[PDB]
Amino acid sequence: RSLKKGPFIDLHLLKKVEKAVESGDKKPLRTWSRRSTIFPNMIGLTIAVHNGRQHVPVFVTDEMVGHKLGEFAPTRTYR
Amino acid sequence: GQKVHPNGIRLGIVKPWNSTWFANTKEFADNLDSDFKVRQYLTKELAKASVSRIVIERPAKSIRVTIHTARPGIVIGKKGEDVEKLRKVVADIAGVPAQINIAEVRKPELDAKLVADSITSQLERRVMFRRAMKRAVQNAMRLGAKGIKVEVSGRLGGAEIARTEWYREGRVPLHTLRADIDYNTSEAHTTYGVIGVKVWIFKGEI
Amino acid sequence: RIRIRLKAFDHRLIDQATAEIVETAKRTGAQVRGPIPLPTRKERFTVLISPHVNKDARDQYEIRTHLRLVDIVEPTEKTVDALMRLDLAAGVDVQISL
Amino acid sequence: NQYYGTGRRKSSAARVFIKPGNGKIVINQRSLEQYFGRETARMVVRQPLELVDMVEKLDLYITVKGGGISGQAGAIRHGITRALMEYDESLRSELRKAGFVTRDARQVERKKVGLRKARRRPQFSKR
Amino acid sequence: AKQSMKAREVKRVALADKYFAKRAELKAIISDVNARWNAVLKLQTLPRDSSPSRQRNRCRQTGRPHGFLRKFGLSRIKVREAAMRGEIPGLKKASW
Amino acid sequence: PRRRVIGQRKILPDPKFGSELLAKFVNILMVDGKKSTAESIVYSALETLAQRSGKSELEAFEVALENVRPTVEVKSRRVGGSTYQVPVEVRPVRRNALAMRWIVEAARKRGDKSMALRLANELSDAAENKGTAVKKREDVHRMAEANKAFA
RNA sequence: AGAACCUUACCUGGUCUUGACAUCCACGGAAGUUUUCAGAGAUGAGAAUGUGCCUUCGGGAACCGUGAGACAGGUGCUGCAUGGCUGUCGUCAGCUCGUGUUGUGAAAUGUUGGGUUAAGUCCCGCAACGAGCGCAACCCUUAUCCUUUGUUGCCAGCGGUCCGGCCGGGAACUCAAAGGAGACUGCCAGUGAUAAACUGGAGGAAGGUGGGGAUGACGUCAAGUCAUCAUGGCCCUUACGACCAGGGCUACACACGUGCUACAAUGGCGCAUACAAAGAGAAGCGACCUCGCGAGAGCAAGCGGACCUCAUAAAGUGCGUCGUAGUCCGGAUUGGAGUCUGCAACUCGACUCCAUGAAGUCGGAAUCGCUAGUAAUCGUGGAUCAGAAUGCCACGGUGAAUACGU
Lengths: 79, 206, 98, 127, 96, 151
Fold this sequence. Notes:
Radius of gyration of chain B: 18 Å
Structural class of chain A: alpha+beta
Strand order of the largest sheet of chain A: 1-2-3
Oligomer: part of a larger assembly
Protein name (chain F): Small ribosomal subunit protein uS7
InterPro entries (chain A): Ribosomal_uS19, Ribosomal_uS19_bac-type, Ribosomal_uS19_CS, Ribosomal_uS19_SF
Radius of gyration of chain A: 13 Å
Largest sheet of chain B: 4 strands, antiparallel
Number of domains of chain B: 2
Number of domains of chain A: 1
GO biological process, one term (chain F): cytoplasmic translation
Order of helices and strands of chain A: HEEE
Number of strands of chain A: 3
Shape of chain B: globular
Keywords (chain A): Ribonucleoprotein, Ribosomal protein, RNA-binding, rRNA-binding, tRNA-binding
Distance between the termini of chain B: 28 Å
Helix content of chain B: 25-40%
Family (chain A): Belongs to the universal ribosomal protein uS19 family.
Strand content of chain B: 15-25%
Distance between the termini of chain A: 32 Å
Number of strands of chain B: 7
Order of helices and strands of chain B: HHEEHHEHHEEEE
Largest sheet of chain A: 3 strands, mixed
């Protein structure tokens, strides 16, 4: 679709993903960057996506690897 | 206030140049920066000197800057006392070997910028604009100048409401392309407001 | 060889500069075919006249780039001397190349 | 010596030549039927040769570039009339009436500010 | 014209030679179909303000972020103010 | 057209037949300023007309068009706070001008296949009259004579 | 003349308070190019090397850290305080000053009339005589010829030919940009107070301000712009400043404007084929070549540019098919799968591939523009810009209808 070869992610969040495997998972990680895609190693973990108010607790799942983190947090409040 | 600017309209018809230099599109952008940058400092140092107008050029990795003035003595000074420090900083801003010329402007009342700067400088003195404008009028046909007119706009005599109250004598053909028209805009720095001084001068037909 | 090419902005500037280079060359030397006029590239710009709105009125701008090509056919050691440094440059970019 | 004439029509410039020989048409090293001129402006190349005694009088070599189909055809139309200088300005006296020697001053109009192309002022909302 | 955002330009422009330009030779031949190792894209933790097309290109005199021309290097208003006072050689009223 | 009075500029004749009447005809049919596609329809219509009817080329469309020539038309006044229609005799320049228009406009309303065929159908029924142009030719005719008062 | 960060001001958070930016005082440190760890980042805390052009020793100029007040900063407020700039009435033909005269005076006259012009244009008349702004003219471009010049442009007469202006050559010609001629109601005819002017004719490429642009009077709307800039005053100042990250400016039960694309057989689709102009291009435009259906990718000439690149213009035209249908019309929406620019494409892109194929079959009252190379229609280029045009600016192709009249 986009991004050509290799899924682009940020460095700081990659360390956070490897921290959840090595040191072990604890709580939902609060991250400001929405640029990084989800990977297979992120399945099972908990993260939280910022979008102009507070980090929304989004859970990672098998088929969510294809889509981005920022898709699961809508920014614009309606209703 | 919708009018074509007398200098710009007459550039193609009857002016020599305000910039005689040539340059190529690649270095043109940074070249035009240095032309206004030198004039920004040059107008400061030639504020009391009463500079009429100056013409920049860059003859093959050099820079001339032909400077005119009402007062040549203040600009030139004793030998090369005043000119050496001017030419030094012009080479530093331009970043190239800098020359310099001098040109005595006979009859300073015939230039637009000199009369505009003379009338607008009297506004800081706090004198009557009717007389200050009339002092330029009183000697119009006396020495040269087949026509001349002076306009002011906004904040007249420290008034609350803003009027124009322009004035004209002689023959000032603003749309005759062949007609020689000298013009320059100037502004006041008074604590009661900012009055803009516009002066159109007519020398001759051809 | 002596393949000259210049560029000037004003409608008549080079015409006197490229005139004086001819009678400098042809008098002392020989041949000198003369100044070829060449196509004038005109870079036209258009921008908005007022700082706010008023797009229906715009002032059109243009910059004409006038070329010339002398091409002296006689490269004698006599004519190359007493020719260079008579350009009396008024800005115009002198270039000598193929 | 050759009998030359220029002519042009809306930025389309031709170069006509006339001689005493045969009436084969040669345009840009190509024939008249092979110069694609089938629809209106088919015989506007031979419009100045309408009212003349010809049968098969003259060689003609012509060469036009610039503009389109009809502009190039009118360049040939006006070009052949200039090439009639073999008969000097004697035959022009009748040709003046036809208006083929008349060069068309109508040129495409420049695009103007606040206009779609040279005239059309873009519509405004109600009053 | 808001001297802070004009000072932010001086930072943004001056970073382009240090972090990128010379060291932005990385990602050119490196991020290409060769031989992969993903450590090359982990060099993108650099400050980012050096980016080759990050400047708005504000006008050199005032600092308007609109109507900028690459030729003159100035905004349309400061083009017209200057143009009517000459200064650009060959510039006059355009008509044809 | 208040002060200035025009010189009424003349168009060039038809390139095949030489008729200056058909030079205006092709231009009525001409949409998008395409003379090449316009005439291709005109000739294809005129060839099918003279072949079917068995008459000559030039007088087929001329006698056809002569049937659809309007006798008189009306003009709206608006003078004394009311609409008055005043009948007037259409001149030979405007007579065939409206004729060529109402032939092309009638053929435009048809739901037939080609433009050459649908235009030729209206040209075919011009001599003996059942079509839409020959109905359209005398529309104001009923409104006229009633307005004979205003003259 | 272009909101994915940036821009960007606004919001939610995290931070800084003589500050991001400028002058001055004191004081230590060359600047700076090296790297590590933590944080989203702003950033604080270490380990490197370096310590450079003047110094009777208090120091210098660049730059950096610290502290102190004067300040710096403000896209904050007032376009009912302004400079500058501009829309509009309007490219409408007007609007004024001198003396002189008329009236007690505001004013009038001039500039009231009769003709005429695009026009306060000109003529005659006149209680005014003159001048000035404006109009006109002078400018640019285009229609034609002459002269100057002949490469990268151009190819007619000649031979040489790989049929390519390609290579001698030839300087004609087109083309190209410098300077001239040429269009003045003047030559002629008629009308007109015998003047201005008008109508027609001749010549001419161009006849009655040739066509178009530029060119916008005195002033009006307290019109717009304190947000480009400049600036009076006011107000906030460990915040309405400043820095960073993410968000918004792209929202969606609604209404209107300005556009593109359609509803098709003057047409759709596929094959073959002919003819432009104006541009842009070195942090660039990219041949040719290879790869991929394609967006493009890799390899990789030439050209700072009449050379080389973007660039294979489309309508049109020659055959075939479709034959009046929600269709081979129409392209929306959505799905799967790609490319490109860039730290970065989910919010929020361009473009490509496969598939899906809403509405819509000429549209209500009413309403917009245009007098000829115009309307209409079909393509191309540029500015902005890393990357996003149906907008905007610029260019050419084909090319009409109707003007009785106010």
